Structure formats: C-alpha cells, structure tokens
Design an enzyme around this catalytic site. Structure first.
Site, PDB file in Angstrom:
ATOM      1  N   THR B   1      16.545 -15.601  24.006  1.00  0.00           N
ATOM      2  CA  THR B   1      16.935 -15.488  25.447  1.00  0.00           C
ATOM      3  C   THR B   1      18.443 -15.666  25.551  1.00  0.00           C
ATOM      4  O   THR B   1      19.075 -16.291  24.682  1.00  0.00           O
ATOM      5  CB  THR B   1      16.195 -16.555  26.281  1.00  0.00           C
ATOM      6  N   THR B  19      15.525 -11.639  27.450  1.00  0.00           N
ATOM      7  CA  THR B  19      15.033 -12.156  26.188  1.00  0.00           C
ATOM      8  C   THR B  19      14.214 -11.182  25.341  1.00  0.00           C
ATOM      9  O   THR B  19      13.729 -10.148  25.851  1.00  0.00           O
ATOM     10  CB  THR B  19      14.186 -13.443  26.433  1.00  0.00           C
ATOM     11  N   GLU B  21      12.085 -13.123  23.263  1.00  0.00           N
ATOM     12  CA  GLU B  21      11.236 -14.288  22.958  1.00  0.00           C
ATOM     13  C   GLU B  21      11.834 -15.088  21.799  1.00  0.00           C
ATOM     14  O   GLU B  21      12.855 -15.739  22.001  1.00  0.00           O
ATOM     15  CB  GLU B  21       9.745 -13.930  22.773  1.00  0.00           C
ATOM     16  N   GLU B  40       6.928 -11.131  23.059  1.00  0.00           N
ATOM     17  CA  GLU B  40       6.774 -11.800  24.356  1.00  0.00           C
ATOM     18  C   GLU B  40       5.339 -12.220  24.675  1.00  0.00           C
ATOM     19  O   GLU B  40       5.121 -13.177  25.396  1.00  0.00           O
ATOM     20  CB  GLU B  40       7.274 -10.905  25.510  1.00  0.00           C
ATOM     21  N   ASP B  43       3.886 -15.776  24.717  1.00  0.00           N
ATOM     22  CA  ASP B  43       4.092 -16.646  25.874  1.00  0.00           C
ATOM     23  C   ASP B  43       2.809 -16.776  26.689  1.00  0.00           C
ATOM     24  O   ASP B  43       2.679 -17.705  27.488  1.00  0.00           O
ATOM     25  CB  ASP B  43       5.244 -16.167  26.788  1.00  0.00           C
ATOM     26  N   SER B  62       6.689 -16.693  32.150  1.00  0.00           N
ATOM     27  CA  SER B  62       8.031 -16.938  31.623  1.00  0.00           C
ATOM     28  C   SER B  62       8.560 -18.281  32.158  1.00  0.00           C
ATOM     29  O   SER B  62       8.081 -18.765  33.178  1.00  0.00           O
ATOM     30  CB  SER B  62       8.997 -15.799  32.052  1.00  0.00           C
ATOM     31  N   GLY B  83      16.303 -20.976  26.363  1.00  0.00           N
ATOM     32  CA  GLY B  83      15.724 -22.178  25.745  1.00  0.00           C
ATOM     33  C   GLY B  83      14.228 -22.363  25.902  1.00  0.00           C
ATOM     34  O   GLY B  83      13.752 -23.493  25.853  1.00  0.00           O
ATOM     35  N   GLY B  84      13.480 -21.280  26.080  1.00  0.00           N
ATOM     36  CA  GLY B  84      12.003 -21.379  26.174  1.00  0.00           C
ATOM     37  C   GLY B  84      11.557 -22.316  27.287  1.00  0.00           C
ATOM     38  O   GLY B  84      12.062 -22.245  28.389  1.00  0.00           O
TER      39      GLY B  84
END
EC number: 3.4.19.13
Lengths: 360, 184
Positions: B1, B19, B21, B40, B43, B62, B83-84
């Site tokens: 990201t 992003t 991922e 992705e 997620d 997300s 940063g997830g």
C-alpha cells in the site's frame, strides 16, 4: 535533495517517492489540477515503488471538488472473480490454508481496479489526457531509475516468491536481487503503458493483455476469466462524515473498514480528554490500546462489502453505543476478553451473516 | 500500500490510498507485460459465514482510510497511510496528535505510534518509553522486545486565510513533499 516538509502558495504534493512527487508537482506547475497530478502520481509510484501499488491492484481515491464543493470517492477496490467461492482458502479438511502460502496463489488475485479508477477520475475532473499523464512513467519504466532503500529492502525480503514467477526476470536478473542503487528497468511494463496510451483502458480490460492476465491467474490456480475483466467497473462511494473537535471529517465507507472505525475510535477516545495526560504517558497508551481492542473486535464482526452484507453503521456510531464501549475501558485494568458489542440494540434490522472467529 | 495527497490552486483536494496487498502482491507478474498482480482477495476471511466472507463479485474488506478534514466548510487537512490493519490506527494517531494534542503537523506524524488489534498482537515504534512498555505489559498487554515502524502518513494542510499549503511526508519511507509556487 528532497524535503519531507514543504510549503507553497499555489499547491502541494506529498507522496512516498521523490520521483513520483516530482512528476505530480510538474503537472501542477504546467497548469494541471490536483486530479491530473494524482493520476500521474499513481502511474509514477506503479513504476518507482512497484511493491506497493499499481495497475495490478486497487485503491480508494477521495476527491473534494473545488468547483462543486462535493466530496466523493472513486472506489477501485478489486472484485473476486465469478469463479471465486466462500471456501476457496480452505484445505480439504476445511481448515484455513496458511496465510504465507495463501498470498502466492492465483485464487488471491482480485480483478484489478486501479486503471479503471484513474480513467474515471479523468473523466470526472481531468484537464490533461491519460496519454499526457502516463508518459513520464513510460519513460521511467523504459529507461529505468536507481533503486531507493525501501525498494532494495523489499526485493531481498521477498526473493522466494519473486523467483517462482516471471517477476524474477525484472527483480532478480541473472538469478540475484538488484541492490541499491542499481538501475531498475521495466521494459514490459513500459510496453503495457504504451498500449494503454494508444488504445485506452481496453488495452488492459480486453484483448491480449486480458487473455494473458486471466490465463496466468488460472496457471497459478485461480478462476479469473476474460469476462471478469470485461465486467469490471469502479464504484462511486459517498463519504461517511463525523464531527471531531470542531472539524468535519470525510472518510471512507464500506467496503473499507477505515472510515467507520476511525470515527468510532475518535468518538470513544474524545471522551477521555487525552491531552490531560502527557503525550508519552502510560495512561495515554493504555487508553489507545484498550480502544483499539474494542473497535478492532467490532470490525472483525460487522464490516464487509455493503453490496453484500448488512453493516450496522448506524448502531456502531450511535452515541449511546459509543458510551457503552467507553464504559468498558479502565486506566487501571485491561480487558482480557475484549469482544464485539451489540450495535443492533441501537438500530433496526439484523446481520445477514454469522459470527465466525478467524484463526491465528 | 501507499498513500499520497495533492491540493491545487482551484481548491481541489485529493487523498488517495492504493495497494496490491502484500509487498509485490502475489509476486505473480503477467508475462511479457510486466504487471505485478495483487493478492487482494486474502483480505477476505479465510473461514466463510461472516460479514467479510469471500463471495464471487464481492470486494474484500479494506483498512484503507484516506480522509479529508474540513473547518468552516473548507478542506483543511488530508490524512492517510499504508500498513494493512494498522492503517486506521496511524490515521487516528496523526489526528489525535495534531488536533487533541495541538502538535505541529510534522511532529504529529513523527510521534511514535502503537497498534494492537487483540490480546496477542502488539506493535510499537521506537520512542515509546521502555518504562511505559513495562507498565503496560505488567497489566497484561503483550508488547514485544523490539520496535517496528508503523504506517507512513502523507498529509497536506491548507490555510485558507493566508492562502498557503503545507505538505508532510513520514520518515518511515523516503517520501517527498513539494510545494507549488507559480512564477506565472
């Protein structure tokens, strides 16, 4: 050199890579608008920060329109292919495939949205063509650039997974990782950008690229078809708004979890008047940590794509709901079993889904 | 990201998180075309039945949180980060330090962050005091033996009365802020 703080009278750009910031700034200098610059920056970061984003992925682009005074979001989040299934990340025994293995499988690949999003942004607000805006990145891809520290760290760290695909020819030439500050050349990507410049986004969503992309996903075990690419479109999302300390905050709704829980944590934490505690005090960190546990629990229970699932947004942000959650927090003691609350007591309806704990 | 932001002289403001991922996504590149493919769909929840289960044509949840804050009906600040799962916390902390603590924007961005989404998952940045970590762990938190960088906030503030912009890039990456001063 470049600066991590700057000021200006006629605009501003901030990005994670100096070459991308320089490209965005040049668009503004040459009479482009913030949307034109943003589109150029995305192509630039696709080349210069290739591990992090690009036309192979998706994003959320929030735009305040200075003409209409409206704020909207171009949501280019990827879609699961038509052949995706609820149990596709489970083994034969019905247990989760380990995350580190899951990540490298063709089933993991969403239908990419980023390019469709850029096209939309330009349709809505552009004053420069995609042909103009993609050109600086074509040149960076074709001619190369020397790799920064964050990039060179990535290639080393991720050598194993890059080695098993076509990516090895770009990032591991002669079988070894590129180093700082070696030249990264991306001839095939440059060619792809040229195809997009000449043919439009059909170079990506249709034709030979779309066939090659779907065949490759299928080679790696996923179900994506050319039809999945042809069907893809972005969504225009309405921001969710909150009030905080005299500010109105426009943030992203589902399918992002970020807006709801940002607003929810701010609403919970606002009660505690944090500034009474020193910025480096244990009290402050305690309150942050306890709030995170509660909000992250609600996120895990209640958030998903709103085309599909009933996210209790009204309940999760109801001020009496916020009050209940804040009451669960103590300075002196830690919740050892933080759980989702029940936002449904503060709104109508019910979940069209179950409560299923994820492993780890 | 990655997160970036742009503001122009006509009042348009963009806050954009984007992003593939994981770093390098799946690691799969479309052969002869150079495109790195997202992972992705991881997620989504691996175990189905809940809000974020996989369905065909559904989008995975997300944590991306591009945000614009307004005062007197004008945009005054943009915030976002990669940063997830940590993203929401990085945007939260930046707003807390800039608004609640009144810190100057670069300082608010650089203020050491923490993140924790459960009793078994904790992160903290360098600068969170060792005695604070000891005190928190003593109550049952589980902060680890070493710090990690959390997030990467790019942010723009706008002063409408003075007619000026200020941009900030987070030191966690080698980002750059570049102001525009047109010669005209």
């Amino acid at each position: 050199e470049y600066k991590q703080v700057d000021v200006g009278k006629d605009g501003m750009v901030a990005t994670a890579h100096p070459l991308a910031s320089e490209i965005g700034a040049d668009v503004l200098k040459k009479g482009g608008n913030a949307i034109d610059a943003a589109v150029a920056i995305q192509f630039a970061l696709n080349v210069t920060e290739p591990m992090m984003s690009g036309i192979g992925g998706g994003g959320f682009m929030m735009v305040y329109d200075g003409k209409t005074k409206d704020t909207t979001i171009i949501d280019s989040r990827e879609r699961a292919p038509a052949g995706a299934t609820p149990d596709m990340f489970l083994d034969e025994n019905g247990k989760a495939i380990p995350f580190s293995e899951r990540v490298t499988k063709g089933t993991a690949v969403g239908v990419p949205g980023t390019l469709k999003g850029l096209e939309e942004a330009l349709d809505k607000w552009g004053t420069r063509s995609m042909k103009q805006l993609i050109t600086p990145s074509i040149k960076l891809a074709e001619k190369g650039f020397p790799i920064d520290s964050v990039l060179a760290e990535a290639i080393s760290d991720y050598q194993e997974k890059l080695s098993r695909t076509a990516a090895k020819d770009v990032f591991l030439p002669n079988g070894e990782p590129l180093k700082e500050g070696d030249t990264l050349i991306q001839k095939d990507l440059a060619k792809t950008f040229k195809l997009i410049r000449s043919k439009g986004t059909d170079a990506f969503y249709k034709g030979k690229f779309a066939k090659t992309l779907s065949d490759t996903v299928q080679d790696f075990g996923g179900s994506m078809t050319e039809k999945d690419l042809e069907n893809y479109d972005i969504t225009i999302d309405e921001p969710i708004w909150g009030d905080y300390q005299g500010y109105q905050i426009a943030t992203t709704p589902p399918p992002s979890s970020g807006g709801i829980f940002l607003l929810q944590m701010l609403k919970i934490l606002d009660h505690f008047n944090l500034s009474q505690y020193d910025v480096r005090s244990w009290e402050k960190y305690q309150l942050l940590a306890e709030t995170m546990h509660l909000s992250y629990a609600d996120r895990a229970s209640y958030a998903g794509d709103p085309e599909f699932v009933n996210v209790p947004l009204k309940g999760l942000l109801h001020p009496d709901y916020i009050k209940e959650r804040q009451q669960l927090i103590n300075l002196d003691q830690v919740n050892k079993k933080p759980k989702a609350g029940d936002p449904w007591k503060y709104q109508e309806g019910s979940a069209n889904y179950k409560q299923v704990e994820q492993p780890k | 990201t990655t997160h970036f932001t742009v503001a122009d002289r006509w009042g348009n403001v963009v806050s954009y998180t984007t992003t593939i991922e994981q770093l390098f996504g799946t690691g799969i590149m479309v052969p002869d075309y150079g495109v790195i493919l997202n992972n992705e769909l991881t997620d989504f929840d691996a175990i189905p039945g809940g809000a974020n289960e996989v369905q065909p044509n559904k989008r995975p949840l997300s944590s991306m949180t591009p945000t614009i804050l307004f005062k007197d009906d004008k945009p005054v600040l943009t915030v976002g980060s990669p940063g997830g799962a940590t993203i929401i916390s990085s945007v939260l902390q930046t707003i807390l330090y800039h608004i609640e603590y009144g810190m100057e924007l670069k300082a608010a961005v650089e203020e050491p962050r923490i993140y924790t989404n459960s009793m078994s998952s904790y992160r903290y940045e360098d600068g969170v005091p060792k005695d604070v970590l000891s005190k928190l762990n003593g109550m049952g938190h589980k902060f680890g033996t070493s710090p990690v960088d959390i997030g990467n906030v790019q942010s723009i503030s706008i002063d409408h009365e003075n007619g000026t912009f200020k941009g900030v890039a987070d030191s966690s990456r080698n980002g750059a802020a570049i102001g525009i001063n047109l010669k005209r």
